[PDB]
Design a protein around this ligand. Structure first.
Ligand SMILES: O=C1Nc2ccccc2/C1=C1/Nc2ccccc2/C1=N\O
Lengths: 276, 147
């Protein structure tokens, strides 16, 4: 309680100051929101990287947990509103790079984010991008029977999880990263804004192609599989991402694979020709 | 086997809390099985959390957290259940769990203080057990040897 509060930007983020540095507070009521916030604290204490939001301190007073984080000027969503209907190709490149760098770091420390979307990405005035909001994140590596399919915001949720998959790898955040890449490169609008699970799958498949049992053998065994009508794979993503070069589009298709095993990893994506 | 590992943990707590000689290694197990059982109240969890791996993880916390000088079984239950709560938070299949069955102490403030204390000490090991399979094997081995 030595933080001077200011403008009120699972919890609530406030801009604040101490006496000197400006910060963001996340205040959390203690009266399963808490189990979720405890997990976020545990993970962030162990993930220090320039492309991941920094947790400075954790406070406990009057039946509240205050997590004290670094402050960034905006999230990517508000960034999209500030400039309008256009990011320079170089800014697209820079943001994807930093995203993949922070995501590559998480994955290499055995952490899945499971909620990649523009509201969870922070942007400084200096053009630094940081991953935030690890409330849905988790550590992996101990052989488990399964996780949870209740993960990722709808528009960023991959088809295997939409098909009810409870088991998944780092490839889950890679689909989400691809969806963000398309937002960056078009005009900051979601690539797949479905109304619900069914309609989401329709949108993905209409653009990419309903996957065959050839491309994705084990799909019929997923607990909420349904056989959609067999739409044209329109692999010329050119019409959806017109300000992306041939090289950018190649990487974008490799992120956006329906079969989680076909998805490029963060490490491989950074070695992609797109970047240089 | 989950059955064996829980007994190894209940044995460990008796070997740790020497002040509780009236303790049978079966009692801690009962406390752990009871919170698991009632969480099956359809929307807290559709499956049991207590598995061989999760007991191992639980043991990891307890070994470094439970004081040898624990005064009572109510105080032991209290810290044991805190550790269990952090196990559910960190390792659980579901994205979150309630407080209810975990809180047995009257002072709520103390519970949360303990949650933060354990986290500030164990956070690196909580990740390392997951990322570093040699370390997982070592802890599983120790737990096995507590028998
Ligand atoms: O400055 C921040 N530090 C954080 C730490 C954790 C989570 C969020 C933030 C955060 C945020 N700063 C913002 C400025 C404008 C709009 C949204 C945010 C935001 N988040 O939406």
């Amino acid at each position: 309680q030595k933080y001077e509060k200011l403008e009120k930007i699972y919890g609530t983020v406030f801009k604040a100051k101490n006496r000197h540095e400006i910060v963001a507070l996340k205040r959390v009521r203690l009266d399963g929101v808490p189990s979720s916030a405890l997990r976020e604290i545990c993970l962030l204490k162990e993930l220090k990287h320039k492309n991941i939001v920094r947790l400075h301190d954790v406070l406990h007073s009057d039946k509240k947990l205050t997590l004290v984080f670094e402050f960034c000027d905006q999230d990517l969503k508000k960034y999209f509103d500030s400039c309008n209907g256009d990011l320079d190709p170089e800014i697209v490149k820079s943001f994807l790079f930093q995203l993949l760098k922070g995501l590559g770091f998480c994955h290499s420390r055995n952490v899945l984010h499971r909620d990649l979307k523009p509201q969870n990405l922070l942007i400084n005035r200096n053009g630094e991008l940081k991953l935030a909001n690890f409330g849905l994140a988790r550590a992996f590596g101990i052989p488990v029977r399964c996780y949870s399919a209740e993960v990722v915001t709808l528009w960023y949720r991959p088809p295997d999880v939409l098909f009810g998959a409870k088991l998944y790898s780092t490839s889950i955040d890679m689909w989400s990263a691809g969806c963000i890449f398309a937002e960056l490169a078009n005009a900051g609008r979601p690539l797949f804004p479905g109304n619900d699970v069914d309609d989401q799958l329709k949108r993905i498949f209409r653009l990419l192609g309903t996957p065959t049992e050839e491309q994705w053998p084990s799909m019929t065994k997923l607990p909420d599989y349904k056989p959609y009508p067999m739409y044209p794979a329109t692999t010329s993503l050119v019409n959806v991402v017109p300000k992306l070069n041939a090289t950018g589009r190649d990487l974008l298709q490799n992120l956006l694979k329906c079969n989680p095993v076909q998805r490029i990893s963060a490490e491989e994506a950074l070695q992609h020709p797109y970047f240089s | 086997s989950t059955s064996e590992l829980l007994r190894c943990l209940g044995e460990f707590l008796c070997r740790r809390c020497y002040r509780l000689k009236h303790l049978s290694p079966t009692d801690p197990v009962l406390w752990l099985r009871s919170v698991d059982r009632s969480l099956l109240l359809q929307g807290w969890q559709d499956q049991g959390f207590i598995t061989p791996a999760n007991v191992v993880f639980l043991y990891m916390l307890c070994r470094d957290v439970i004081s040898s000088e624990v005064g009572s079984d109510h105080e032991l239950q209290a810290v044991l259940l805190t550790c269990l709560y952090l196990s559910y938070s960190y390792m659980g299949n579901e994205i979150s769990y309630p407080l209810k069955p975990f809180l047995v102490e009257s002072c709520k403030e103390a519970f949360w203080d303990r949650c933060l204390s354990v986290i500030n000490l164990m956070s690196s090991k909580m990740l390392q057990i997951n990322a570093d399979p040699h370390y997982f094997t070592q802890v599983f081995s120790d737990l096995k040897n507590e028998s």
